[PDB]
Structure formats: C-alpha cells, structure tokens
User: Which sequence fits this backbone?
C-alpha cells in the first residue's frame, strides 16, 4: 500500500521519497508512456524494408 | 662406291542486406571519396 515508495539513492535502499522531495509533473510519465506505446504500435505494423 | 654425296527472378529489390552492410559500404566510401 505504500504508494510513494521509491529508490532512495542517498539512503541506499527503499524509503518514502516524498520526504526526499523527489517529485516530477504527471505530464512527463504520462507523455512518455503515451509516446512510447504509440511508437511501439507503429513499429509493430511493419513487415518489410525497401531500398530506394 | 663409298665416295658419293656422303663424302529467373532477376528482379530482386534487396530489402535489408544493404542496411546490414552499410557500415562496410561507408567504410569504403569515405576512403573512395
């Protein structure tokens, strides 16, 4: 149930990172996930390469 | 006596091989240029 448990590089283990002030905007992870999924879907619909 | 004259499928359109070999192609192409 620890929603905000992350890798604490300073402590060297696992701990709550909101106490470490390690935060990022949502439209970084969301954008990365969306764009990566779209790119993977685009690549999966490819079955040949042609040299011009 | 002794004394005498004596005394099909031509169209290939290669697909990926050029991509695989472009490293060596450019390796030779730089020196050729």
Assistant:
């Amino acid at each position: 149930g620890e929603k905000t448990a992350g890798i604490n590089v300073r402590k060297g283990g696992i701990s709550n990172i909101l106490e470490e002030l390690v935060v990022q905007p949502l439209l970084v992870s969301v954008s990365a996930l969306t764009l990566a999924t779209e790119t993977v879907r685009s690549i999966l619909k490819i079955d040949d390469v042609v040299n011009t | 006596s002794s004394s005498e004259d004596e005394d099909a499928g031509e169209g290939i359109s290669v697909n990926t091989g050029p991509k695989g070999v472009i490293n060596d192609w450019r390796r030779f192409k730089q020196l050729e240029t």
The radius of gyration of chain B is 36 Å.
